[PDB]
Ligand binder design. Structure first.
Ligand SMILES: [Mg+2]
Ligand SMILES: [Mg+2]
Ligand SMILES: [Mg+2]
Ligand SMILES: [Mg+2]
Ligand SMILES: [Mg+2]
Ligand SMILES: [Mg+2]
Ligand SMILES: [Mg+2]
Ligand SMILES: [Mg+2]
Ligand SMILES: [Mg+2]
Ligand SMILES: [Mg+2]
Ligand SMILES: [Mg+2]
Ligand SMILES: [Mg+2]
Ligand SMILES: [Mg+2]
Ligand SMILES: [Mg+2]
Ligand SMILES: [Mg+2]
Ligand SMILES: [Mg+2]
Ligand SMILES: [Mg+2]
Ligand SMILES: [Mg+2]
Ligand SMILES: [Mg+2]
Ligand SMILES: [Mg+2]
Ligand SMILES: [Mg+2]
Ligand SMILES: [Mg+2]
Ligand SMILES: [Mg+2]
Ligand SMILES: [Mg+2]
Ligand SMILES: [Mg+2]
Ligand SMILES: [Mg+2]
Ligand SMILES: [Mg+2]
Ligand SMILES: [Mg+2]
Ligand SMILES: [Mg+2]
Ligand SMILES: [Mg+2]
Ligand SMILES: [Mg+2]
Ligand SMILES: [Mg+2]
Ligand SMILES: [Mg+2]
Ligand SMILES: [Mg+2]
Ligand SMILES: [Mg+2]
Ligand SMILES: [Mg+2]
Ligand SMILES: [Mg+2]
Ligand SMILES: [Mg+2]
Ligand SMILES: [Mg+2]
Ligand SMILES: [Mg+2]
Ligand SMILES: [Mg+2]
Ligand SMILES: [Mg+2]
Ligand SMILES: [Mg+2]
Ligand SMILES: [Mg+2]
Ligand SMILES: [Mg+2]
Ligand SMILES: [Mg+2]
Ligand SMILES: [Mg+2]
Ligand SMILES: [Mg+2]
Ligand SMILES: [Mg+2]
Ligand SMILES: [Mg+2]
Ligand SMILES: [Mg+2]
Ligand SMILES: [Mg+2]
Ligand SMILES: [Mg+2]
Ligand SMILES: [Mg+2]
Ligand SMILES: [Mg+2]
Ligand SMILES: [Mg+2]
Ligand SMILES: [Mg+2]
Ligand SMILES: [Mg+2]
Ligand SMILES: [Mg+2]
Ligand SMILES: [Mg+2]
Ligand SMILES: [Mg+2]
Ligand SMILES: [Mg+2]
Ligand SMILES: [Mg+2]
Ligand SMILES: [Mg+2]
Ligand SMILES: [Mg+2]
Ligand SMILES: [Mg+2]
Ligand SMILES: [Mg+2]
Ligand SMILES: [Mg+2]
Ligand SMILES: [Mg+2]
Ligand SMILES: [Mg+2]
Ligand SMILES: [Mg+2]
Ligand SMILES: [Mg+2]
Ligand SMILES: [Mg+2]
Ligand SMILES: [Mg+2]
Ligand SMILES: [Mg+2]
Ligand SMILES: [Mg+2]
Ligand SMILES: [Mg+2]
Ligand SMILES: [Mg+2]
Ligand SMILES: [Mg+2]
Ligand SMILES: [Mg+2]
Ligand SMILES: [Mg+2]
Ligand SMILES: [Mg+2]
Ligand SMILES: [Mg+2]
Ligand SMILES: [Mg+2]
Ligand SMILES: [Mg+2]
Ligand SMILES: [Mg+2]
Ligand SMILES: [Mg+2]
Ligand SMILES: [Mg+2]
Ligand SMILES: [Mg+2]
Ligand SMILES: [Mg+2]
Ligand SMILES: [Mg+2]
Ligand SMILES: [Mg+2]
Ligand SMILES: [Mg+2]
Ligand SMILES: [Mg+2]
Ligand SMILES: [Mg+2]
Ligand SMILES: [Mg+2]
Ligand SMILES: [Mg+2]
Ligand SMILES: [Mg+2]
Ligand SMILES: [Mg+2]
Ligand SMILES: [Mg+2]
Ligand SMILES: [Mg+2]
Ligand SMILES: [Mg+2]
Ligand SMILES: [Mg+2]
Ligand SMILES: [Mg+2]
Ligand SMILES: [Mg+2]
Ligand SMILES: [Mg+2]
Ligand SMILES: [Mg+2]
Ligand SMILES: [Mg+2]
Ligand SMILES: [Mg+2]
Ligand SMILES: [Mg+2]
Ligand SMILES: [Mg+2]
Ligand SMILES: [Mg+2]
Ligand SMILES: [Mg+2]
Ligand SMILES: [Mg+2]
Ligand SMILES: [Mg+2]
Ligand SMILES: [Mg+2]
Ligand SMILES: [Mg+2]
Ligand SMILES: [Mg+2]
Ligand SMILES: [Mg+2]
Ligand SMILES: [Mg+2]
Ligand SMILES: [Mg+2]
Ligand SMILES: [Mg+2]
Ligand SMILES: [Mg+2]
Ligand SMILES: [Mg+2]
Ligand SMILES: [Mg+2]
Ligand SMILES: [Mg+2]
Ligand SMILES: [Mg+2]
Ligand SMILES: [Mg+2]
Ligand SMILES: [Mg+2]
Ligand SMILES: [Mg+2]
Ligand SMILES: [Mg+2]
Ligand SMILES: [Mg+2]
Ligand SMILES: [Mg+2]
Ligand SMILES: [Mg+2]
Ligand SMILES: [Mg+2]
Ligand SMILES: [Mg+2]
Ligand SMILES: [Mg+2]
Ligand SMILES: [Mg+2]
Ligand SMILES: [Mg+2]
Ligand SMILES: [Mg+2]
Ligand SMILES: [Mg+2]
Ligand SMILES: [Mg+2]
Ligand SMILES: [Mg+2]
Ligand SMILES: [Mg+2]
Ligand SMILES: [Mg+2]
Ligand SMILES: [Mg+2]
Ligand SMILES: [Mg+2]
Ligand SMILES: [Mg+2]
Ligand SMILES: [Mg+2]
Ligand SMILES: [Mg+2]
Ligand SMILES: [Mg+2]
Ligand SMILES: [Mg+2]
Ligand SMILES: [Mg+2]
Ligand SMILES: [Mg+2]
Ligand SMILES: [Mg+2]
Ligand SMILES: [Mg+2]
Ligand SMILES: [Mg+2]
Ligand SMILES: [Mg+2]
Ligand SMILES: [Mg+2]
Ligand SMILES: [Mg+2]
Ligand SMILES: [Mg+2]
Ligand SMILES: [Mg+2]
Ligand SMILES: [Mg+2]
Ligand SMILES: [Mg+2]
Ligand SMILES: [Mg+2]
Ligand SMILES: [Mg+2]
Ligand SMILES: [Mg+2]
Ligand SMILES: [Mg+2]
Ligand SMILES: [Mg+2]
Ligand SMILES: [Mg+2]
Ligand SMILES: [Mg+2]
Ligand SMILES: [Mg+2]
Ligand SMILES: [Mg+2]
Ligand SMILES: [Mg+2]
Ligand SMILES: [Mg+2]
Ligand SMILES: [Mg+2]
Ligand SMILES: [Mg+2]
Ligand SMILES: [Mg+2]
Ligand SMILES: [Mg+2]
Ligand SMILES: [Mg+2]
Ligand SMILES: [Mg+2]
Ligand SMILES: [Mg+2]
Ligand SMILES: [Mg+2]
Ligand SMILES: [Mg+2]
Ligand SMILES: [Mg+2]
Ligand SMILES: [Mg+2]
Ligand SMILES: [Mg+2]
Ligand SMILES: [Mg+2]
Ligand SMILES: [Mg+2]
Ligand SMILES: [Mg+2]
Ligand SMILES: [Mg+2]
Ligand SMILES: [Mg+2]
Ligand SMILES: [Mg+2]
Ligand SMILES: [Mg+2]
Ligand SMILES: [Mg+2]
Ligand SMILES: [Mg+2]
Ligand SMILES: [Mg+2]
Ligand SMILES: [Mg+2]
Ligand SMILES: [Zn+2]
Ligand SMILES: [Zn+2]
Lengths: 50, 249, 112, 86
RNA sequence: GCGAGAGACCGAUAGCGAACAAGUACAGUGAUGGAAAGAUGAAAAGAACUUUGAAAAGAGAGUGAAAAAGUACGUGAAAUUG
RNA sequence: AAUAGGGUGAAGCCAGAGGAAACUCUGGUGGAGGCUCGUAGCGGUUCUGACGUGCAAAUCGAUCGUCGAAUUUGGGUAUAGG
RNA sequence: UGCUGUAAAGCUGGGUCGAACGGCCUCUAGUGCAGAUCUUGGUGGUAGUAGCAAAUAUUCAAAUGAGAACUUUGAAGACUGAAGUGGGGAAAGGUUCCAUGUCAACAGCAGUUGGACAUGGGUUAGUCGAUCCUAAGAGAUGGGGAAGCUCCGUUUCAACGUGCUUGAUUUUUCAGGCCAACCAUCGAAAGGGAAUCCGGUUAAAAUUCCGGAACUUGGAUAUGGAUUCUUCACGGCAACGUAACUGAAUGUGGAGACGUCGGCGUGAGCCCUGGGAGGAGUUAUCUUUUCUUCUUAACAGCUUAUCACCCUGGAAUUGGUUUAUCCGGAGAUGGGGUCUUAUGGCUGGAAGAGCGCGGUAAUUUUGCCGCGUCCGGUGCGCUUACGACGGUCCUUGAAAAUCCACAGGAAGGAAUAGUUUUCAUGCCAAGUCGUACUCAUAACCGCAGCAGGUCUCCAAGGUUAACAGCCUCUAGUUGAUAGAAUAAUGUAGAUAAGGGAAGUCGGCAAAAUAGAUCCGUAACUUCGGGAUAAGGAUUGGCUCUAAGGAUCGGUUUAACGAUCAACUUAGAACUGGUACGGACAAGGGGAAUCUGACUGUCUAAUUAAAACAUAGCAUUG
RNA sequence: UAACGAGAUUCCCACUGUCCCUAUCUACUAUCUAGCGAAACCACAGCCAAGGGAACGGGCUUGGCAGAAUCAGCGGGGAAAG
RNA sequence: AAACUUUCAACAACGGAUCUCUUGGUUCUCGCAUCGAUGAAGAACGCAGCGAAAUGCGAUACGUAAUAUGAAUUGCAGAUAUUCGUGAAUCAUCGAAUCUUUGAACGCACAUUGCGCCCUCUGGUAUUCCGGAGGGCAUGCCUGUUUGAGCGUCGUU
């Protein structure tokens, strides 16, 4: 809702930051195995936990 | 089987009394020096309806004998008591309607209400609308008085116990039919969760000793021993007799 | 006709969420939230509304002068005129009778 | 109508985030955590749920202090500073 | 728990649930439940350039010992299919 | 916190008529009731209609019960597996 | 490619491949698969099949683009029809909001579009909510149980103030003066509650920003005024008035603050409408026409009211009076006054704003100039707020925080000066968290962009009893794969000669009736009902007729004149393919038996009933 | 037992496609196309008659017969599926 | 005869069996004794020149100090970085520090980044109001200190 607590709003800020695509320069590191961010989250598809 | 409706009431989850709207506990004054030795005078400020009670309550203001303050008491209103009336309470109070007197100061045949069972408990007997206590006689050597209670029982009480002169107001309430389930719903809406009652014979054997059968019937005597246990005491408990009451008792 | 919306997060027609309909200088029609109507100061003896005293919501009495909250008499903002008149007469007559009940209980302490 | 129509009336959270474990197991009306038992002094744990102990035990977090007890013990819990060799 | 050394043990559907960003993703209001998932090549040398196509791509070409190794990656069975 | 529009017309009240009296009658007024037709609402009678790998793990259509109270309902709160 | 062996199997030619492996004597075992509705993984036929059919509906053109039924724009045709497909919110979601780019995956067709993907941007508060209060309740403490996790208890068998108030003291010590019924705490974004409005502004925020104009609380504090030599003001018979105009402990009240309905009155907003000043549309003909602008916030001053109250006075020939029945020697009618300021008016705020026109500046940030923005009427109208009343209950319809007044009279107070911040003005500050967006036939939950579910606010015109149904204004959509045909059988909807329940377990389904006015209305009955019983007539359009008021004006023929004004009812003539509640809307009726008295309740998802409940009755403790 | 009842039952008036006995019309399907594209089920499969047989065969025995590839319907059988 | 269906072979698909590996697991043995109010285990939120995760860390935030060693780090960038040296990198080592909001969690409270009070300093003309900086205020129990209470009780007037 529009009326939300600080504890809730701080968790929603982290959820946005965890939803980024992989930075592309990370695939250039030697012996790198990460091809993409495997922890993407869509708002409609998978719900958080607040 | 299952816990029957009798036993669930003791836990008091949904079976506590609905007391939001109540106007205070109806009690006599605390027995103090003034009532023990003389009399104290108060004035009736209000006569109000108490939800869940057939009897109206009276709010009576007295002065504090020891500090500068007014004390408001909640008495059960006797019929004929009016707002602005002077109420006298103590050993030396006069025999007027609304006054609070010890039982020994009242002659035989005195009609009294809100009588103390024990000295200083501030009223136990005859508190509902239309009911009263008749003073039967005195035993001055043992300081005891015989009275007749609204149930017709005779009791021996200390002559120092106090009571309020008159009959509790609001009598004759039972003379009128309720006429409706809704009227009983509103009656018990401010008393407690005890209405309506499902008949045990119409439930299943898990729910009640009377449940089950291809016809509705109790199957065994509904008079239950006094020494029976909880979950069994459903019906006529310790019934001395059954059937239509014919003649005097 | 133009229709309006609440101005606060409360969406319910409660007693403290009452609105009036006001036309603005912009020719629009907006809701203006109203505070609950004040009740009249009443006599502590008879319960009637006291004359000469402003009808305000209780906190607003702190920020108004004393002449609005009282009447120039004994028990000014507390009791009505008739209840003060009855207090004065009752005090005088009863205390006068107190002397009468005293002197009689001294005439009988020398003859009885 | 006990299925899909009744499932539409789920908008009152029974649990919210716990301050001790942050799990959304804090019963709002009970004021208790169903996971760690907060605000009880002891941690909720059962021997009939050994997998639950795996999920929350020593080593599942940072061990920000027990990390170094082995390394401090191995040196006999030195007090002072290391001396540079000449 | 800490620190080591081992085995007629298992060899990615096995061996701990987890050889991998595994108690992870995800489910459930909740207690709890709980995976799948290793392998190009010695070395990215991970295919410049030209050309058709709107593009993905394709055809020439190039690297490489091998492209009958192109991150749909060693080997590449069967079911099933052109 | 919420509940269109109608019907019926309870006490109380006004006026007139008849009568010796006890009383009765008439015209208004009034607006009662877990009254009534009927929306919203709440429910769910029948087609044993549709659908019955559905729009849907209970829905859709028409028809229907009730609809000012034992009414409907939000949120908070209480009761926990013999 | 063959060879060997009865066989389990072994060996070998060719192809592929790339790092280990085998023969023999023995040891050892998690050692041999076709099944176990086996397990896990992978793949078929079915099969380009079932199907993608609810929510009225799309079409032409241009632009863009490689590509357009589906994107954008324009034109049209439509729908939702204020109980919305509109405009906001609570819960829940969490960036879905906005801009730019964008089509591999997703939007069960498509896609240049998107709630998708990528990159950035975006949520501004003393006044809006939290925070504070307490509700049901939750729950520490002293304690009491229990082996114990813990249970009980909430002022309880308790020595329960981290007390205050002053005069101070500058001696950072004190001197004391009062009190300690009740008093941990949490518990409401719908209860209670200090205070903000208008105009403008962004791509996206606004009661938050800008401009202007206010307000509350806490604190500080000076000037003016007020008051005193009769020290703590005056006036009024009184209700009471005021710019002010001492007041400790303690006490008493009020506000906070209270159910549900009925009619009536007033206001506000909306609806309707006349004149005038503008703009747009129709104009073959008609229409002094149809549509549209003419608005005014919080706040300040003055004024303004039903109720209530005061002074006067003494009433039967009783009077006053409401739609509704009450009041008066416990003092009516009459005359004269006092109060609350809800509400309206005037003025300031404030025309400078906004709005409607006309003339211009210019790629142009953005304007600049001129004119107008005025005066009314109407009402069983709608909605809503308030008010004075009336009804109702074996139902009488929260608490606390907080604010004020009064009683009381402690204490301190003047004359050459004293007091007070409840009169006016002036100074400082108001922290923390939320604030974007959806609120649903696509932002929540139902596995999903699901015909389901999910709390609430506003509400135009016509017809009408109606917020019903139908049509329309504002607003919003035109979304649901599309194209072509129109066999059978379907699903939904219509009609039918004559017969009229012969069908069928059964009139299931459908039909018939239906609004309104007038007439008429049975048995039985608990006298309340039954009842819309049953059964008939009428109903359109037009032109008339009659009836039903408001406000004023003077010896009571005002029994008359003047002005203004609403839709109701009744009757008549004429009229027409005998039609007319013309769509919409809308009872089938009657005679009986069984059964439960009735209203009400339950088997969410096969049973709504005669089952349960109920009032009443009786019994028990 | 008045009143009430989506309660069970019988008859009468009105009414009608329930019926004699069926016919016609509309929209959406079904149908064909572009695109998209599942599922149940599956020992092997799929023409009959008799015989015998686990006493009711698609298969066995003896006969009838038998000619590619197919489309819309249908509900006898697969002692169909669930 | 085509087509279709079926069988077989080659190649191409689908799929990931087989073979071979293995910083993992599993089991046995040997050795050791070290959590926490000096705030543990765990949770939440943050931290990099360019980072989402894992790992590490805490506003000194993929780290500061020290010791050792001795020239890197590396995907790119970049020193006002370094090389015969107090000197690159390094969870190599580690003895000094930092260590957010919390958590037995300790001023009270917490679905709130809610609400107090004390001490010192400081700003706003301030012991009192508002702001800021630093340091404090939990409970049970033990020893001790101080201040008290009770005709429980002892001496004396
Ligand atoms: Mg928000
Ligand atoms: Mg969802
Ligand atoms: Mg979760
Ligand atoms: Mg048993
Ligand atoms: Mg008692
Ligand atoms: Mg009950
Ligand atoms: Mg019963
Ligand atoms: Mg009973
Ligand atoms: Mg039963
Ligand atoms: Mg028995
Ligand atoms: Mg039993
Ligand atoms: Mg029985
Ligand atoms: Mg029976
Ligand atoms: Mg029986
Ligand atoms: Mg029997
Ligand atoms: Mg808003
Ligand atoms: Mg009041
Ligand atoms: Mg009083
Ligand atoms: Mg009173
Ligand atoms: Mg006054
Ligand atoms: Mg006043
Ligand atoms: Mg579910
Ligand atoms: Mg609910
Ligand atoms: Mg709950
Ligand atoms: Mg949860
Ligand atoms: Mg930690
Ligand atoms: Mg080790
Ligand atoms: Mg080890
Ligand atoms: Mg070793
Ligand atoms: Mg595995
Ligand atoms: Mg490999
Ligand atoms: Mg591989
Ligand atoms: Mg390699
Ligand atoms: Mg190598
Ligand atoms: Mg290439
Ligand atoms: Mg290429
Ligand atoms: Mg090539
Ligand atoms: Mg080469
Ligand atoms: Mg090779
Ligand atoms: Mg190969
Ligand atoms: Mg290869
Ligand atoms: Mg492959
Ligand atoms: Mg290879
Ligand atoms: Mg390969
Ligand atoms: Mg194959
Ligand atoms: Mg309506
Ligand atoms: Mg009605
Ligand atoms: Mg009826
Ligand atoms: Mg409605
Ligand atoms: Mg409905
Ligand atoms: Mg039908
Ligand atoms: Mg059916
Ligand atoms: Mg079907
Ligand atoms: Mg129909
Ligand atoms: Mg109906
Ligand atoms: Mg209905
Ligand atoms: Mg009804
Ligand atoms: Mg009611
Ligand atoms: Mg059980
Ligand atoms: Mg159990
Ligand atoms: Mg158990
Ligand atoms: Mg039991
Ligand atoms: Mg058992
Ligand atoms: Mg190799
Ligand atoms: Mg085996
Ligand atoms: Mg197998
Ligand atoms: Mg199988
Ligand atoms: Mg399988
Ligand atoms: Mg298949
Ligand atoms: Mg098809
Ligand atoms: Mg379909
Ligand atoms: Mg449609
Ligand atoms: Mg393009
Ligand atoms: Mg379309
Ligand atoms: Mg379309
Ligand atoms: Mg268009
Ligand atoms: Mg329409
Ligand atoms: Mg409507
Ligand atoms: Mg809406
Ligand atoms: Mg919301
Ligand atoms: Mg972003
Ligand atoms: Mg958008
Ligand atoms: Mg875009
Ligand atoms: Mg698509
Ligand atoms: Mg996104
Ligand atoms: Mg604030
Ligand atoms: Mg506020
Ligand atoms: Mg907050
Ligand atoms: Mg605060
Ligand atoms: Mg505050
Ligand atoms: Mg407060
Ligand atoms: Mg309480
Ligand atoms: Mg407790
Ligand atoms: Mg106690
Ligand atoms: Mg000191
Ligand atoms: Mg609180
Ligand atoms: Mg609140
Ligand atoms: Mg509130
Ligand atoms: Mg409120
Ligand atoms: Mg402006
Ligand atoms: Mg401006
Ligand atoms: Mg501006
Ligand atoms: Mg906005
Ligand atoms: Mg102030
Ligand atoms: Mg004056
Ligand atoms: Mg005081
Ligand atoms: Mg009050
Ligand atoms: Mg209240
Ligand atoms: Mg109310
Ligand atoms: Mg009332
Ligand atoms: Mg009213
Ligand atoms: Mg009006
Ligand atoms: Mg003009
Ligand atoms: Mg025209
Ligand atoms: Mg205001
Ligand atoms: Mg006269
Ligand atoms: Mg009336
Ligand atoms: Mg002009
Ligand atoms: Mg001019
Ligand atoms: Mg309204
Ligand atoms: Mg009212
Ligand atoms: Mg009122
Ligand atoms: Mg006073
Ligand atoms: Mg006093
Ligand atoms: Mg005084
Ligand atoms: Mg504050
Ligand atoms: Mg908003
Ligand atoms: Mg909404
Ligand atoms: Mg909305
Ligand atoms: Mg939906
Ligand atoms: Mg929906
Ligand atoms: Mg939407
Ligand atoms: Mg579902
Ligand atoms: Mg779910
Ligand atoms: Mg509601
Ligand atoms: Mg209408
Ligand atoms: Mg409306
Ligand atoms: Mg419609
Ligand atoms: Mg459609
Ligand atoms: Mg079509
Ligand atoms: Mg047809
Ligand atoms: Mg049909
Ligand atoms: Mg037709
Ligand atoms: Mg026809
Ligand atoms: Mg016809
Ligand atoms: Mg016919
Ligand atoms: Mg004919
Ligand atoms: Mg007939
Ligand atoms: Mg007939
Ligand atoms: Mg028949
Ligand atoms: Mg028949
Ligand atoms: Mg028959
Ligand atoms: Mg028959
Ligand atoms: Mg039959
Ligand atoms: Mg029918
Ligand atoms: Mg017909
Ligand atoms: Mg009739
Ligand atoms: Mg009848
Ligand atoms: Mg006519
Ligand atoms: Mg109809
Ligand atoms: Mg019928
Ligand atoms: Mg019944
Ligand atoms: Mg009713
Ligand atoms: Mg019923
Ligand atoms: Mg129920
Ligand atoms: Mg059912
Ligand atoms: Mg049913
Ligand atoms: Mg029913
Ligand atoms: Mg009886
Ligand atoms: Mg008895
Ligand atoms: Mg019936
Ligand atoms: Mg029924
Ligand atoms: Mg019968
Ligand atoms: Mg029979
Ligand atoms: Mg037919
Ligand atoms: Mg049709
Ligand atoms: Mg078909
Ligand atoms: Mg097709
Ligand atoms: Mg098959
Ligand atoms: Mg055969
Ligand atoms: Mg055969
Ligand atoms: Mg067979
Ligand atoms: Mg054979
Ligand atoms: Mg044969
Ligand atoms: Mg044959
Ligand atoms: Mg068949
Ligand atoms: Mg089948
Ligand atoms: Mg079967
Ligand atoms: Mg051939
Ligand atoms: Mg190992
Ligand atoms: Mg935290
Ligand atoms: Mg060195
Ligand atoms: Mg630091
Ligand atoms: Mg830390
Ligand atoms: Mg917090
Ligand atoms: Mg905190
Ligand atoms: Mg708090
Ligand atoms: Mg301690
Ligand atoms: Zn009074
Ligand atoms: Zn927890």
């Amino acid at each position: 809702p529009s009326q939300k607590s600080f504890r809730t709003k701080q968790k929603l800020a982290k959820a946005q930051k965890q939803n980024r695509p992989l930075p592309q320069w990370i695939r250039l590191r030697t012996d790198n195995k990460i091809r993409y961010n495997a922890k993407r989250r869509h708002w409609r598809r998978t719900k958080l936990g607040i | 089987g299952r816990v029957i409706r009798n036993q669930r009431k003791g836990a008091g989850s949904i079976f506590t009394s609905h007391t939001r709207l109540r106007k205070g506990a109806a009690k006599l004054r605390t027995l103090d020096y003034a009532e023990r030795h003389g009399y104290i005078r108060g004035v009736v400020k209000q006569i109000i309806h108490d939800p869940g009670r057939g009897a109206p309550l009276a709010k009576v203001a007295f002065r504090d004998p020891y500090k500068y303050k007014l004390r408001e008491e909640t008495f059960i209103a006797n019929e004929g008591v009016y707002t602005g009336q002077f109420i006298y309470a103590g050993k030396k109070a006069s025999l007027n309607v609304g006054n609070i007197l010890p039982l020994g100061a009242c002659p035989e045949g005195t009609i009294v209400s809100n009588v103390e069972e024990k000295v200083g408990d501030r009223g136990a007997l005859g508190r509902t609308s239309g009911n009263y206590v008749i003073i039967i006689g005195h035993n001055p050597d043992e300081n005891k008085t015989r009275v007749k209670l609204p149930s017709g029982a005779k009791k021996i009480i200390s002559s120092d116990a106090r009571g309020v002169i008159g009959v509790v107001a609001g009598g004759g309430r039972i003379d009128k039919p309720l006429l409706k389930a809704g009227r009983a719903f509103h009656k018990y809406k401010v008393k407690r969760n005890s209405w309506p009652k499902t008949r045990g014979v119409a439930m299943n054997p898990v729910d009640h000793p009377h449940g089950g059968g291809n016809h509705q019937h109790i199957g065994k005597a509904s008079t239950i021993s006094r020494g029976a246990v909880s979950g069994q005491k459903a019906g006529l408990i310790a019934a001395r007799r059954t059937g239509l009451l014919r003649g005097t008792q | 006709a133009q229709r309006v919306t609440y101005r606060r997060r409360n969406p319910y027609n409660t007693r403290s969420n009452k609105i009036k309909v006001v036309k603005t200088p912009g020719g629009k029609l907006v809701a203006q939230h109203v505070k609950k109507a004040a009740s009249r100061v009443k006599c502590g003896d008879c319960g009637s509304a006291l004359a000469g005293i402003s009808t305000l919501r209780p906190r607003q009495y702190a920020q108004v002068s004393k002449t609005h909250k009282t009447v120039q008499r004994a028990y000014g903002g507390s009791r009505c005129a008739n209840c003060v008149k009855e207090r004065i007469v009752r005090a005088f007559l009863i205390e006068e009778q107190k002397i009468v009940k005293r002197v009689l209980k001294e005439q009988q302490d020398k003859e009885k | 109508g006990k299925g899909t129509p009744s499932l539409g009336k789920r908008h009152n959270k029974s649990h919210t985030l716990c301050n001790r474990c942050g799990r959304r197991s804090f019963h709002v009306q009970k004021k208790t955590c169903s996971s760690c038992g907060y605000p009880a002094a002891k941690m909720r744990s059962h021997n009939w749920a050994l997998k639950a102990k795996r999920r929350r035990t020593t080593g599942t977090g940072r061990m920000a202090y027990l990390k170094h007890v082995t390394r401090r013990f191995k040196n006999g819990f030195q007090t002072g500073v290391a001396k540079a060799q000449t």
